[PDB]
Structure 1
Amino acid sequence: AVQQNKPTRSKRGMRRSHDALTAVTSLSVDKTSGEKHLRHHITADGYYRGRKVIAK
């Protein structure tokens, strides 16, 4: 180990470039309820592709 001398702040600023997040940038609208939900995932109310399942 033993860094012989310290890196800059600019350096680590570059190391953290690719570390940035990527946004989903896509959502859906329920076939019935009109709710916002992910693709292939159920709505909070449980509606998936217009069908009700959980009822909890």
Structure 2
Amino acid sequence: AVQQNKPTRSKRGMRRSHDALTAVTSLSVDKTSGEKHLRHHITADGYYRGRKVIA
């Protein structure tokens, strides 16, 4: 329930081989306002798929 030996710099970074965040690299431009947005999300100004939805 507790370690017998302090793990190393090696094993601490080996565990964080999968802690690395994944960037999006998939921003989508809107066809009526040219805003980049998340795919299938509305824009910051409230356009979505060419239509003004939220305003």
TM over 0.5: yes
CA distance in 1, matches of 2:29, 2:2: 54
How many corresponding residue pairs? 55
Q: Pairwise CA RMSD of aligned residues? A: 0.8
Helix, strand or coil: the match of 2:47? Answer: coil
CA distance in 1, matches of 2:35, 2:4: 57
Structure 1 residue runs without a partner (length 5+): none
Following TM superposition, by how much is the alpha carbon of 1:38 offset from its aligned partner in structure 2, in angstroms?
0.9
Following TM superposition, by how much is the alpha carbon of 1:10 offset from its aligned partner in structure 2, in angstroms?
1.1
CA distance in 1, matches of 2:35, 2:41: 12
Following TM superposition, by how much is the alpha carbon of 1:5 offset from its aligned partner in structure 2, in angstroms?
1.1
Q: In proportion to residue count, which structure has more strand? A: 2
**Percent identity between the two aligned chains:** 100
Q: Which runs of 4+ in 1 moved over 4 A?
A: none
Q: Cα deviations across residues 11-45 of structure 1 (Å, max 9, x unaligned)? A: 11100111111111111111110111111000011
